[PDB]
Ligand binder design. Structure first.
Ligand SMILES: Nc1ncnc2c1ncn2[C@@H]1O[C@H](CSCC[C@H](N)C(=O)O)[C@@H](O)[C@H]1O
Ligand SMILES: Nc1ncnc2c1ncn2[C@@H]1O[C@H](CSCC[C@H](N)C(=O)O)[C@@H](O)[C@H]1O
Lengths: 68, 262, 262, 69
C-alpha cells in the first residue's frame, strides 16, 4: 500500500495511467480487493488500518487565535 | 549547528519542492509534523534520523495548553541545533502558514547566533485555489484564524473569497480541546450574519493527503454549519456575498469612468 | 489530448514540486511563462518541446490590450489539446494565483470535453511569508490586485497583513501600458490614507529568481511610494496599522472574557 | 557554465550549504569569471543575464488584471 501510494504520488506517468484505469493499475500493483474497495469508497480510516498505522494518532493544529 | 524549516505540501511524496527534499535528505536530524503514517514512512525512508513532533500534543485525555505543546516543539528543535546538528524541521504544507513553531524556532535560533531560514511550501490555501478553480486575485482574498475572528475585531470585505482556518476549533478559548461545540459554531453563524445571509452557500474544504483520495468540497448554506461534520484539517471558504462595484470616487481622481477601463 | 497546469515557483529549478517536474518531463508539449533565460534553459533541458507564451505580450511598442494577450495564450494552449497532445502549461509560481490563463484554459478544456486540472505551486506570497518571517494567521491576511483596489470598492482590515499585487501598474486603466505613473501612485497613497498614516512603514518585496540572489525587502514610509523604484514583479506589503482589539459582543455570547483566553 | 552552476545550486542542498559557507570559493571552483562573481556580489541581475547570453530575453510577467471580467 505505502510503496504504491509513494510511487503514484511522485510519478506523473503512473498518475496518468491510474486516472485512465484505477482498478487495473491498483491490481497491477498487487492491491487486495478490500484495499481497492477502501479506495473507491474513499474510506481513508480503513486504508490506514490495512497499511499498519491508524494506531498512529495525528493532530495537525500548529497555531492559535488568542494572540501573544 | 543550523536550522532549515521546510514544508512537505499536503499530498504524499510529490508535493515537496525538489530543493526541500534535498534539505531533508542531507539533514543530520529531522523534526517532523506530517499528516499520516504513509507520509511518516516516506520521510523515514528519505532520512531515518527523525523525531516526531506529534508526541508533544496532549496524550490520553490530558489537559494541555497548546502554547506549552508549541514551546516544547521549539525547544526540542533548538536542542538539536545547540548540540551542533544540521537540523531540518519538516512541517506539512508551508512551514510558516498558520504555524508558529518554525517562525518561533527561527527567531530563537538567530537570537542564539545560529544560521536559520525557512523554505516556502505548498499550503492548504494553495491546494484550494487549484481544487476549486478560484483565483485569489479575481475579487480579492482574506484569511483569518476562526477563533481570532470570534475573539477580536476583524471586518471582512464581502466582495472577497474569505477563508476561516481551524474552523473545527472556532471559539475553543482554553486551547486544551481538540474540537469546538455546535453552540459555538451557531454563535459564529450569527456573527457572520452581519455580512452574509443565513442561506449564503459556504464550502467546507479538505485537500487530499493521498494520491488515490479526492478532496472534500462540501457546499451547504451558512445556517447548516453548526450541524456539519468538521475535522481539524477542515477549512471554511465563504465566497463573495456582493459583486464588485465601481469606485466612482477614485475614478473621478484618475479623471476616468467605467467606460474607459480596458 | 489533455491539459495539466503546473507552477515552477519563483526560484530556478529547485522550487517546483517533485510531481510537477514529472508532469513537465512526460508532456508531449509545454506552454511556458517563466521569469528569465536561466529558467527557460532549465525547462528546455527537461522537455525540448516548448512554446514560449511570452511571445503574445505587446512587442516593439505596439498598443495591445492584455485581455487579447491572455485570450491568445489560452487559444494557443487549447489548440495543442484539441490536436490530441498531452499538454502542460508551466507558469512561474502557482499557476492559478493572480493568473487568469490557467483557470480560463481549464474551464475551456472541460467545456470542450478534455481532461484538465491544475497542480498547486509555491507563489510569490508563499515566498514573502518565509523571507519576512511573517505568518498570515498571526493577525490575518488580505490580498488585492492594486488596480482593482482603486477601480472597485474594497475595504481593508487594518489589523491584517495587506498585500497589493501588481503595484507597478496601479491605476493603469487601459491594460496597454507596462507601468503606471507617480501621479497614479500618489492617488493610491491618498486612498490608502483612509486607514494608514502617511508615515506608515510599508515594504516593497521581490522574491529572488536565482539561488545567488537575495530578495528585495525595501522599507519606506507609505508617503514615499510614488517616488519608489517598482518593477512588474514588485508586491507592496502593508503591515497592520492597529493592534487586535477584544470583540466584547461575541466574548459575552460565549460567556467569557480576555482573562479566560488560554 | 553560468547556467549549469545556477541550475545545480538551485536543486542541491549539499551544494547550497557549501555555497552559503564560502560563496566566492564555490563560484571560482565552478568556473565563474571575476566579472560574473562581481555581478553576483553586487546583486546586478541585469549584467548576469548579459554574461549568460541574454540575446534580449525580454520577460513581462503580469498574467492578470483588475478591471473585472
Ligand atoms: N488537508 C487540508 N485541507 C484543508 N485545509 C487544511 C488542510 N490541512 C490543514 N488545513 C488548514 O490549516 C489549519 C491548520 S494550520 C497549518 C496550515 C499548514 N501550514 C498549511 O500550509 O496548509 C487547519 O485547521 C485548516 O484550516
Ligand atoms: N519575484 C516576485 N516577488 C514578489 N512578488 C512577485 C514576484 N513575482 C511575481 N510577483 C507578484 O505577482 C504579480 C503577478 S501575478 C502572478 C503571480 C504568480 N502566479 C505567483 O504565484 O506568484 C506581480 O505583479 C507581483 O505582485
Amino acid at each position: 500500500l505505502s510503496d504504491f501510494f509513494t510511487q503514484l504520488g511522485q510519478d506523473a506517468q503512473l498518475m496518468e495511467d491510474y486516472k485512465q484505469n484505477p482498478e487495473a493499475v491498483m491490481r497491477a500493483h498487487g492491491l487486495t480487493d478490500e484495499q481497492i474497495n477502501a479506495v473507491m469508497t474513499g474510506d481513508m480510516e480503513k486504508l490506514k488500518t490495512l497499511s499498519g498505522d491508524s494506531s498512529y494518532q495525528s493532530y495537525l493544529v500548529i497555531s492559535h487565535g488568542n494572540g501573544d | 549547528g543550523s536550522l532549515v524549516c521546510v514544508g512537505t505540501g499536503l499530498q504524499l511524496a510529490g508535493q515537496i519542492s525538489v530543493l526541500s527534499r534535498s534539505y531533508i535528505e542531507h539533514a543530520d536530524i529531522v523534526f517532523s509534523l506530517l499528516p499520516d503514517g504513509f507520509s511518516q514512512r516516506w520521510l523515514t525512508k528519505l532520512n531515518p534520523n527523525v523525531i516526531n513532533l506529534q508526541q508533544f500534543y496532549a496524550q490520553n485525555g490530558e489537559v494541555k495548553n497548546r502554547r506549552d505543546t508549541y514551546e516544547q516543539m521549539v525547544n526540542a528543535i533548538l536542542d538539536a541545533v545547540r548540540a551542533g546538528k544540521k537540523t531540518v524541521c519538516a512541517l506539512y504544507g508551508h512551514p510558516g502558514v498558520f504555524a508558529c513553531v518554525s517562525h518561533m524556532a527561527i527567531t530563537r535560533a538567530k537570537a542564539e547566533g545560529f544560521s536559520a531560514k525557512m523554505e516556502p511550501g505548498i499550503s492548504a490555501e494553495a491546494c484550494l485555489w487549484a481544487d476549486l478553480g478560484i483565483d485569489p486575485g479575481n475579487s480579492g482574498h482574506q484569511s483569518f484564524e476562526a477563533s481570532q475572528f470570534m475573539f477580536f475585531n476583524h471586518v471582512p470585505d464581502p466582495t472577497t473569497h474569505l477563508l476561516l482556518w481551524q474552523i473545527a476549533i472556532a471559539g475553543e478559548h482554553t486551547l486544551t480541546q481538540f474540537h469546538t461545540s455546535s453552540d459555538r459554531l451557531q454563535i459564529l453563524v450569527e456573527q457572520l450574519n452581519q455580512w452574509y445571509p443565513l442561506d449564503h452557500e459556504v464550502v467546507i474544504y479538505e485537500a487530499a493527503n493521498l494520491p488515490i483520495q479526492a478532496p472534500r468540497i462540501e457546499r451547504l448554506p451558512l445556517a447548516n454549519l453548526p450541524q456539519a461534520h468538521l475535522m481539524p484539517i477542515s477549512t471554511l471558504l465563504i465566497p463573495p456575498a456582493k459583486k464588485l462595484e465601481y469606485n466612482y470616487a477614485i475614478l473621478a481622481k484618475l479623471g476616468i469612468g467605467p467606460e474607459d477601463l480596458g
